[PDB]
Amino acid sequence: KDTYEVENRYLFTNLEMFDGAWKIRKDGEVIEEKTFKIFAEPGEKRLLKIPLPEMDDSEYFLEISFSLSEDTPWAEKGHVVAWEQFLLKAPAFEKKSISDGVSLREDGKHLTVEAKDTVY
Amino acid sequence: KDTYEVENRYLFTNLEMFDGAWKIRKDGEVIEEKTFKIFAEPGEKRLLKIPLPEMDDSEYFLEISFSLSEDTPWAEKGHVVAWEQFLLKAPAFEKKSISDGVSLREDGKHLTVEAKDTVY
Amino acid sequence: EEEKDLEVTLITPDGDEKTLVKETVKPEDRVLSFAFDVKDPKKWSAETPHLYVLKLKLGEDEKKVNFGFRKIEIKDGTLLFNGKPLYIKGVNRHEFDPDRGHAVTVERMIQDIKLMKQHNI
Numbered sequence: 001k002d003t004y005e006v007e008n009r010y011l012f013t014n015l016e017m018f019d020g021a022w023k024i025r026k027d028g029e030v031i032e033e034k035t036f037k038i039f040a041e042p043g044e045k046r047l048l049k050i051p052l053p054e055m056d057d058s059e060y061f062l063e064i065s066f067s068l069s070e071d072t073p074w075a076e077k078g079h080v081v082a083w084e085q086f087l088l089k090a091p092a093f094e095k096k097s098i099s100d101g102v103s104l105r106e107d108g109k110h111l112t113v114e115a116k117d118t119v120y
Numbered sequence: 121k122d123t124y125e126v127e128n129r130y131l132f133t134n135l136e137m138f139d140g141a142w143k144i145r146k147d148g149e150v151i152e153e154k155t156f157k158i159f160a161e162p163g164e165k166r167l168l169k170i171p172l173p174e175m176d177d178s179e180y181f182l183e184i185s186f187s188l189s190e191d192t193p194w195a196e197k198g199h200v201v202a203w204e205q206f207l208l209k210a211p212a213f214e215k216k217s218i219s220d221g222v223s224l225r226e227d228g229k230h231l232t233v234e235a236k237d238t239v240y
Numbered sequence: 241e242e243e244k245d246l247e248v249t250l251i252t253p254d255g256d257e258k259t260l261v262k263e264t265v266k267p268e269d270r271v272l273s274f275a276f277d278v279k280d281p282k283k284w285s286a287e288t289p290h291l292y293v294l295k296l297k298l299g300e301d302e303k304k305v306n307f308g309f310r311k312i313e314i315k316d317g318t319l320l321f322n323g324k325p326l327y328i329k330g331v332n333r334h335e336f337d338p339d340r341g342h343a344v345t346v347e348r349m350i351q352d353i354k355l356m357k358q359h360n361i
Contacts, residue, residue: 057217095215097177107275 001088004048004064008040015040018066018081022050024088025061057092061085121208124168124184128160135160138186138201142170144208145181177212181205241267244299248274251293253282265298283322284308331361 008015020036032053040046050062065083068075105112113120128135140156152173160166170182185203188195223234233240248261260276282290291306313320320326333352337344 056219092217093215094217095213097212097214099176108273 002050002052004050004086005045006038006040006048006064007045008042010042012042014042015046015066017069019069019078020048021065021067023063023065024053025063026058027091052088055089057094058089059091060088062088122170122172124170124206125165126158126160126168126184127165128162130162132162134162135166135186137189139189139198140168141185141187143183143185144173145183146176146178147211148181172208175209178209179211180208182208243267245297246272247295247297249295250276250278251295253290253292278309281309284310285322329361331356 016039023030024032063085068079070077103114136159144152183205188199225232243264246265250258294305296303335344
């Protein structure tokens with residue numbers, strides 16, 4: 001969950017040329033962003049350690065991305081060349097006992113069901 | 121759920137000699153009781169209709185018993201000679217997201233976990 | 241142009257009467273819809289053909305309809321009538337008379353029905 005293996009598949013490019021970033025998303029919204037650099041020659045595999053926070057019953061998702069450190073003839077600083085995402089933790093589902101009532105009215109052509117301020 | 125078939129397996133006795141009762145139990149406590157008599161000769165099967173209440177997310181169980189209408193040389197009025205139970209509705213189980221924290225202290229020979237006012 | 245009174249009376253198989261509806265109605269092309277409850281009604285079957293009567297009056301216009309309480313349904317591939325398994329003991333009939341062709345009389349219709357019931361159809 002905290003350990004990730006990066007593999008450089010460029011023929012003639014070191015991964016040091018790119019700005020690394022990782023983000024953690026709680027139920028879709030983010031909560032933690034960090035930048036990093038990683039040295040890896042063409043072909044090489046390198047490990048990446050990501051400290052994780054204590055996590056409540058929400059659903060957590062990591063996203064790891066590389067971008068352009070500075071402008072290029074074909075694109076501007078920050079442009080994203082590669083990303084991958086992973087489920088950290090699934091969510092805990094709640095189930096709630098409902099005590100409140102529901103009415104019902106039958107007529108020739110309709111069944112009517114009332115609950116709070118909604119009629120079906 | 122409402123309709124039950126009684127079979128009289130005595131050789132020489134009519135079920136009319138016995139006091140019929142049914143009970144409903146919500147999470148184990150009685151909430152409804154009702155007496156009844158049923159005419160059935162030796163061998164016969166008879167139907168028994170039971171009106172059911174509207175039921176919340178709890179677990180309901182129906183019991184149907186027969187007892188002695190009056191004393192006998194071998195037992196008193198109200199002695200039970202037969203009974204059977206049945207599930208009416210399984211319960212709806214709640215799951216609650218917990219937002220409160222938990223503390224952790226490691227030492228040489230013990231891990232200690234505090235939550236509310238209980239230490240494990 | 242003038243408004244007319246609408247009355248709807250239910251008559252039981254016994255013969256007892258009850259007013260369901262009594263209201264004035266402005267003259268217009270409309271469809272009025274009503275729903276009424278009836279405790280322990282006498283159910284229509286081929287064995288026991290109990291009929292009720294509706295009596296409908298709007299101004300001087302008067303009509304009468306014969307209905308019977310009965311339910312047909314399919315439960316798990318089985319055909320029910322009033323909540324009992326139904327077995328169709330039937331025959332196919334042509335509206336035919338050897339002297340009159342298709343122009344059959346009520347006296348010949350009644351003969352047919354009494355013959356069918358007397359042979360368990």
